[PDB]
């Protein structure tokens, strides 16, 4: 489990309860929840292991954000809003859909103004519709003055020191995430370091280390769902994915003010708690440190993942067609390495 | 089959008969036997398909070679002589044995003078022993005057024009091969072009095109038996090697004066005819033409073989240990591409 639901100050009762969590097939153990001043927290980040930091004040000025405040102040830029008839918002790269014309995504992307997102959300709730929305938009220069001021008030002192201490590359973006209760982002890994800053509502985060690659079966690299797990967590096909019976997760529920370090290459499944209302999150994506000058053997799990990705990319290019990658790989192994 | 046994001139009867051929599980069709002046012969060489040329005179001065002549004239250099208790002289690279300390070769290499090879051969025949010898030695500068003169008398005019016409690289070596009746060199492919010049006795040659890679199951690249088939032709394991049930060979029996073009990457199984006496062959190995400037898609079979070899080599280097290549490849494919 995630650990006992945290009790809110002022005797406001349990923030959430276990009935708001979806049911899955695998065991988990809790991600540590620590103060940013705790040396164990620094130890985990340094070793690229997840930790929830409870007191960074990383996005303190954003803790007042709700739909009314954001709509008044976030400007008139476009926001990417995904729509689905399922709770699962499986990520896919539109640019790879040409490689797999048989892939029919279950979520669709629509660009709209922030007030149109609020209105569509309101229409759905009144009509009792089952349609789900998930706003996922990189923050940019079109935001209004008050959002600029809030953003400037993030704890750049703390996170800049992390970036420097860990040798990371640049901050590439901040993703603003606004979801409906019950929304799920299925398990995947990212090739950047991530500080995941919860603002409103509660998200259950289930992480898996890079050495569970064999259990989580990412799509082919050239598939639209590169880096995402092929396993349906709600109905796992153990005939196709037998080592999913061996997966073990690291679990936590983050609430307003919490920051989760999601290390590069770590798998993560994220869900907005059932009956928990809307959720708001801002993340901080950093490029990882460069390949070290001297390679130490045996390689770490994340280095083998990087190798496998590059083998798939190179074969797709050399064979001139990503569909020939599988057949060549099978020819290489059958009766030779298996 | 190989085609009707050729009838020798002067009414000397069939050179050989089908009872001298070993029995295998797969069908074959005959390699064309043509004159070097036949445009179809040039067409096959140009398209990297095998052909037996009957009238090249490529090694005409060597057709008088026997053990007595060679012993008198081939000098006092060392000759590599393989010894085995089986008819199969499976090739292996001594330099890769460190990677696979569990590999126990069934043939051993011993360096000796040519007269010691003749004497060991004579001891075996008198004592009725079952030990087999196979002399396999690159021709070099230590050979005596009469062998030098014979070698100078090869048809360099004809073969030099082939090398030039096909864009091949340099002649890298000439392998002298002297085997006992019944000796077999198991199926493998070479990364050079080969003109195979038969001098004494008869060899059955069974070739398989590069697109039968999937049926012939070469050892891992880092194994001592790189480029050789794992299938025991005398007892094929169809559970491990199911597509060996689909292999189809191109077959011929070469005799004195014949030259077989064995194209680069073509699999070949070579056997000295049962009860046929000793065999003598000299081959001519040429580096292949370079990779073309413009790549045409889809790739040819031999280009996919080159890619697979390089993937295995690169992974062995990057993982720091050739034993980790298999596990990484299986992790890449299981539940992802298979």
């Amino acid at each position: 489990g995630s650990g006992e639901p945290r009790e809110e100050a002022g005797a406001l009762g349990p923030a959430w309860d276990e009935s708001q969590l979806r049911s899955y097939s695998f065991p988990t153990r809790p991600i540590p929840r620590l103060s940013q001043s705790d040396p164990r927290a620094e130890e985990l980040i340094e070793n690229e292991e997840p930790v929830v930091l409870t007191d960074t004040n990383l996005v303190y000025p954003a803790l007042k954000w709700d739909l009314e405040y954001l709509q008044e102040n976030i400007g008139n830029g476009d926001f990417s809003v995904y729509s689905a008839s399922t709770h699962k918002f499986l990520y896919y790269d539109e640019k790879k859909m040409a490689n797999f014309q048989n892939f029919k995504p279950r979520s669709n992307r629509e660009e709209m103004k922030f007030h149109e997102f609020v209105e569509k959300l309101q229409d759905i709730q009144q009509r009792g519709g089952e349609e789900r929305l998930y706003l996922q938009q990189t923050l940019n220069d079109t935001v209004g003055r008050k959002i600029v001021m809030d953003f400037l008030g993030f704890n750049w002192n703390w996170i800049n020191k992390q970036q420097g201490k860990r040798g990371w590359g640049q901050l590439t973006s901040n993703l603003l995430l606004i979801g409906m209760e019950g929304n799920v982002t299925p398990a995947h890994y990212d090739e950047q370091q991530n500080f995941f800053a919860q603002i409103k509502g509660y998200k259950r985060c289930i992480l898996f280390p890079p050495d569970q690659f064999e259990c989580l079966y990412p799509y082919p690299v050239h598939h639209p769902c590169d880096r995402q797990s092929q396993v349906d967590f709600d109905n796992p096909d153990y005939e196709r994915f037998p080592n999913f019976q061996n997966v073990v997760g690291y679990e936590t529920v983050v609430g307003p003010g919490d920051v989760l370090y999601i290390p590069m290459y770590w798998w993560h499944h994220i869900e907005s708690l059932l009956n928990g209302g809307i959720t708001i999150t801002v993340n901080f994506w950093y490029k990882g440190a460069p390949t070290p000058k001297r390679i130490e053997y045996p390689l770490k799990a994340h280095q083998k993942v990087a190798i496998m990705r590059n083998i798939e990319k190179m074969l797709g290019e050399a064979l001139g067609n990503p569909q020939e990658v599988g057949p060549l790989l099978n020819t290489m192994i059958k009766g030779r390495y298996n | 089959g190989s085609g009707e046994p050729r009838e020798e001139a002067g009414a000397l009867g069939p050179a050989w008969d089908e009872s001298q051929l070993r029995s295998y599980s797969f069908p074959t069709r005959p390699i064309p036997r043509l004159s070097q002046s036949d445009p179809r012969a040039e067409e096959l060489i140009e398209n990297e398909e095998p052909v037996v040329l009957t009238d090249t005179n490529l090694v005409y001065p060597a057709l008088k070679w026997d053990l007595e002549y060679l012993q008198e004239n081939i000098g006092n250099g060392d000759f590599s002589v393989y010894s085995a208790s089986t008819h199969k002289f499976l090739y292996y690279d001594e330099k890769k044995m460190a990677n696979f300390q569990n590999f126990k070769p069934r043939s051993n290499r011993e360096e000796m003078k040519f007269h010691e090879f003749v004497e060991k051969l004579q001891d075996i025949q008198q004592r009725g022993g079952e030990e087999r010898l196979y002399l396999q030695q690159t021709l070099n500068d230590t050979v005596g005057r009469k062998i030098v003169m014979d070698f100078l008398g090869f048809n360099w005019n004809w073969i030099n024009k082939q090398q030039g016409k096909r864009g091949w690289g340099q002649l890298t070596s000439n392998l002298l091969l002297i085997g006992m009746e019944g000796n077999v060199t198991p199926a493998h492919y070479d990364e050079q072009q080969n003109f195979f010049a038969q001098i004494k006795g008869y060899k059955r040659c069974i070739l398989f095109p590069p697109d039968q890679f999937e049926c012939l199951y070469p050892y891992p690249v880092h194994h001592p038996c790189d480029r050789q088939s794992q299938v025991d032709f005398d007892n094929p394991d169809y559970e491990r090697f199911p597509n060996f049930q689909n292999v189809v060979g191109y077959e011929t029996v070469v005799g004195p004066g014949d030259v077989l073009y064995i194209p680069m990457y073509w699999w070949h199984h070579i056997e000295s005819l049962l009860n046929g006496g000793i065999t003598i062959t000299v081959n001519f190995w040429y580096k292949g033409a370079p990779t073309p400037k413009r790549i045409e898609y889809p790739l040819k079979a031999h280009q996919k073989v080159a890619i697979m070899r390089n993937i295995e080599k690169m992974l062995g280097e990057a993982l720091g240990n050739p034993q980790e290549v298999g596990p990484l490849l299986n992790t890449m494919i299981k539940g992802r591409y298979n």
Binding site: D93, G288, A306 | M314
Partner: peptide, 18 residues
Amino acid sequence: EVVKLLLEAGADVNAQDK
């Protein structure tokens, strides 16, 4: 060279490129 080639990380994340 080849080892560093195969070890090179990408930077892809779950955010759609335009």
